Design a protein around this nucleic acid. Structure first.
Lengths: 263, 182, 126
RNA sequence: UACCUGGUUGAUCCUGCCAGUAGCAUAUGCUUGUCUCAAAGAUUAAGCCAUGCAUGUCUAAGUACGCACGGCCGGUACAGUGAAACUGCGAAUGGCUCAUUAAAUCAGUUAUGGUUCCUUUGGUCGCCUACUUGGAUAACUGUGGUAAUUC
RNA sequence: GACGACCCAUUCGAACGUCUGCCCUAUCAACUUUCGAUGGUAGUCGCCGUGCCUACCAUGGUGACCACGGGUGACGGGGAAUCAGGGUUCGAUUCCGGAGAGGGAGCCUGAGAAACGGCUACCACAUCCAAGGAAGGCAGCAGGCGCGCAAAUUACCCACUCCCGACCCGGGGAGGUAGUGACGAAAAAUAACAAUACAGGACUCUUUCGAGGCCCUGUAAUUGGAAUGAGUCCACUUUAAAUCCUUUAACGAGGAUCCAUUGGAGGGCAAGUCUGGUCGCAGCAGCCGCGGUAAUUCCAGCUCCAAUAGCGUAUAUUAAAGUU
RNA sequence: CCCGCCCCUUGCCUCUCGGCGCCGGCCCGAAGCGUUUACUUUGAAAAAAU
């Protein structure tokens, strides 16, 4: 079957980090088309009945979205399979709560509640600079927003703080060694550490070393690096564990050390 | 979806020596079938197979430490192994009888009221015992070490408090309606 | 008989206008009491009266002596009547849907394909 | 469980096969008290098929003079509900089978700086008529034709 | 707010292309070329790159490191069975990719199709008819015929899971539920305890004799008290509605019934030179061999052994095979 | 069995642009690489179920 694009998605080929079961039926939600990559998305309904358990059936989530209590990036969305991804803020204004989508140290989108103050902006990577007609420059970001007239000194692999309401960036970082970074793709995920070094090749990818403040060195491809703030100075509130990432032996030891699994 | 076959069959079909061991082992613990024996012996040989891996690979490699620690923890948790042992070499000193001792029917007999091992199996199945608060029908439980002092009769049953059975309660009414006047 | 309803996973679900918890029940007599009896008692534990209590679940553990279900409590009637799955409203009546069903529907449709401009005729034919 | 046992001779030691042994999956015989899990017209005929059913769809927001219902008071564009019909969108997804197919398919790896892209998301949206231009089609009404059709 | 539209970016992809990887055959060793084979130059065509196609021109390309040709009960892969180490065999079948809707060819619409629950024609089939004409494609779910060693209900329902639509509201044999089901897997009932009765042996006393006495055993006779689900069955519960299960009344066990079978007993190989019948007949026997009047192997009875809700038989395949 | 020393020691330079130094002048990291492979060791990179 290949006379056009498919529309079903199974459960057993579903991207594994949404933590689905398999004794519910064959299908899984499928992200609809949008700004983030299909693998990198967390569909809306999985945050609302397969995490926080406001709803219990998919029809219930549709009944929440219809009354429009949900926002994403300060605008109103009303699908059940809206494709939100990394660095967005969800905002329920009927609870007074704001969430942030960020990577756990085990590489899955966690619940990271935040102040309303922080929830007025997000961190956006620059990917492309493109001169349009009549000599105007542009930015292009991973959340796929086109912000016209950027000041010229911003280059790709940099990051920019965006004001959700108005565009028109507040600050930026210029990519270099000794800046604090998060990993967003690759087999490493959610790890935090300073850049330390870069390496360039002519075509065919290139890699970027990273080192943290716990004395571990690891590397990742260039295009999986994301900047979060100046050296040892995050401009976001980080979820617990701080991207350090333990081994399984040490992690076991903590649970049996406090002797705690309930409270 | 997922299944597996727990027991295995003997390689040789007949051998007087082998058969005598399987017979006398069943006699001791009051087991039903030889399939209930080979099941146990599978478990032992399985644990012995995992163990034989870990002994070859240098100490202070992460695979050997984390696995061994959690393996031995589980052997200690059921109490077929001492913590005065707790080395991977002592896994191999394990043998068939220590498993069979931890079975529920053996522990019913050992630490509760029975008259023979044959009695004790029947009490578990006729629901006259519990394990802490919970009725069981399984005389093949394996009983965690901590819980070998919470084996009690059932809180409702003719043994301990609870209603009289229908052999008793029949005969009580046999003094008034079975021979009382009719 | 002996009825113990014990409160576990209390959540105030403002978005759906309800309060959802677990219904943990202990009873060493005959386990499993009617769901009608349960919602009476839970009505007089948060004082909300039994026309906004809804319960379901109630599988009884092996050996009895405990049963565990899942219960909602709505703020008002109209909020229940709107949200509530159709079968759960019809469970203790205040709602129904007449269902013929599912052969009468299909057989009408296939007859309707044959005519045009009149939808009422095939239905009139009985 | 890193294993063998019977058979060529009057007798012995070899070579070698046969038979014995255990698992697995299809068929079949005989027998069967309770519980949970569940494979099932592939093998041969990608042979052939009665009958029934398996894709439709409307919000305050494209088009309501149904003579339908309703109104309460109507019409100033003019209600409220609304079958029908034009219009929009989908039917290129799923489901099923394994016949063809040996560098083909396919798998890992790479490339579009050689290209297209419904849709979503973000930008782009001022070189005797305008108080709003033109004329037909369906439903509908009425009259028909065929042995017979979703004509 | 709703709607529409142009271009760029993005998402979902799509399409071509790189390197490496494939089962058997030499009783297949040379093959390919103007019916383009390989290359050059320009053009045509196509979404674009390209002998994809045309004109002109060049004479190459591939092979014993197995080409080319032929075969395949060959869809490919993620995998599956067996196994010390190394391997061998299988993969139609739930995920991913591909191909196809009786066989062929052509084509409309659309962003997307060489679509078949769209269309047009041939060929092969087959239906209705007033004989003038008209209509059809179950390798979709059920069901039937045929084929065979060999395979289920013309059941219930959109509640779950998701998908489709102008849309919170509609629809979906996708999907969920039940039935048939000894493919296969997990759990484990078919009697437990005293009395009497004989029986054994440690033990004690006694010079032996003998007696006492303890530990257990079966085994008879009855019994005695106790216990329980198998079933029957009001009730709760389950769920879309129901079944089942778990939960609970009341009934429900004395061994005779609320009955365990399948194979075997000469050797391999755990188990009888018991009795009757048959007497190289009838039959048994994977193998070696049994049967000709005293049958440890046949036909039965008795007894015993193995496995146990299972066991036997046929065939494919692995281990056994250091007999690839 | 990580720096260096006998001649060698991660072989060289040449330098120049953007930091570190010390008091215009001077020193040392990054830039071309050691004839090529295999081999070995580490990273990156990999759908899920099993």
């Amino acid at each position: 079957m290949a006379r056009g694009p498919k529309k079903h998605l199974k459960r057993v080929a579903a991207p594994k980090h949404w933590m689905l079961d398999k004794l519910t039926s064959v299908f899984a939600p499928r992200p609809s088309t949008g700004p983030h990559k299909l693998r990198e998305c967390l569909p809306l309904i999985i945050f609302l009945r397969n995490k926080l358990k406001y709803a219990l059936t998919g029809d219930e989530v549709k009944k929440i979205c219809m009354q429009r209590f949900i926002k994403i990036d300060g605008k109103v969305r009303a699908d059940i399979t809206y494709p939100a991804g990394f660095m967005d803020v969800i905002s329920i204004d009927k609870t007074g709560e704001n969430f942030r989508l960020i990577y756990d140290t085990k590489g899955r989108f966690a619940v990271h509640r935040i102040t309303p103050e922080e929830a007025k902006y997000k961190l956006c990577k620059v990917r492309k600079i493109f001169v349009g007609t009549k000599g105007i420059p542009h930015l292009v970001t991973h959340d796929a927003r086109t912000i016209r007239y950027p000041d010229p000194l911003i280059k790709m692999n940099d990051t920019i703080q965006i004001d959700l309401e108005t565009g028109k960036i507040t600050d930026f970082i210029k990519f270099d060694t000794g800046n604090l970074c998060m990993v967003t793709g690759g087999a490493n995920l959610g790890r935090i550490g300073v850049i330390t070094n870069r390496e360039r090749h002519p075509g065919s990818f290139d890699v970027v070393h990273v080192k943290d403040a716990n004395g571990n060195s690891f590397a990742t491809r260039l295009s999986n690096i994301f900047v979060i703030g100046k050296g040892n100075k995050p401009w976001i509130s980080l979820p617990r564990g701080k991207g350090i990432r333990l081994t399984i032996a040490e992690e076991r030891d903590k649970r049996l050390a406090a002797k705690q699994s309930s409270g | 979806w997922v299944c597996r076959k727990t027991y295995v069959t003997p390689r040789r079909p007949f051998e007087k020596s082998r058969l005598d061991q399987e017979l006398k082992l069943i006699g001791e613990y009051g087991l039903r079938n030889k399939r209930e024996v080979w099941r146990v012996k599978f478990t032992l040989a399985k644990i012995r197979k995992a163990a034989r891996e870990l002994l070859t690979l240098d100490e202070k490699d992460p695979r050997r430490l984390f696995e061994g620690n959690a393996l031995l923890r589980r052997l200690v948790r059921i109490g077929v192994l001492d913590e005065g042992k707790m080395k991977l070499d002592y896994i191999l000193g394990l043998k068939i009888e220590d498993f069979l001792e931890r079975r529920l029917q053996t522990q019913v007999f050992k630490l509760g009221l029975a008259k023979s091992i044959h009695h004790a199996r029947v009490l578990i199945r006729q629901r006259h015992i519990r394990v802490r608060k919970q009725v069981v029908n399984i005389p093949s439980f394996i009983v965690r070490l901590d819980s070998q002092k919470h084996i009690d009769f059932s809180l409702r049953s003719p043994y301990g408090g609870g209603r009289p059975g229908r052999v008793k309660r029949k005969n009580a009414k046999k003094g008034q309606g079975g021979a009382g006047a009719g | 008989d002996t009825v113990t309803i014990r409160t576990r996973k209390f959540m105030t679900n403002r978005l759906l206008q309800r309060k959802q918890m677990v219904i943990d029940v202990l009873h060493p007599g005959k386990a499993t009491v009617p769901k009608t009896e349960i919602q009476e008692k839970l009505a007089k534990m948060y004082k909300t009266t039994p026309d906004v209590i809804f319960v379901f679940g109630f599988r009884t553990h092996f050996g009895g002596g405990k049963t565990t279900g899942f219960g909602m409590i709505y703020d008002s009637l109209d909020y229940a009547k709107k949200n509530e799955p159709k079968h759960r409203l019809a469970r203790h009546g205040l709602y129904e849907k007449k269902k013929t069903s599912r052969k009468q529907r299909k057989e009408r449709k296939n007859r309707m394909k044959k005519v045009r401009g009149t939808a009422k005729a095939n239905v009139g034919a009985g």
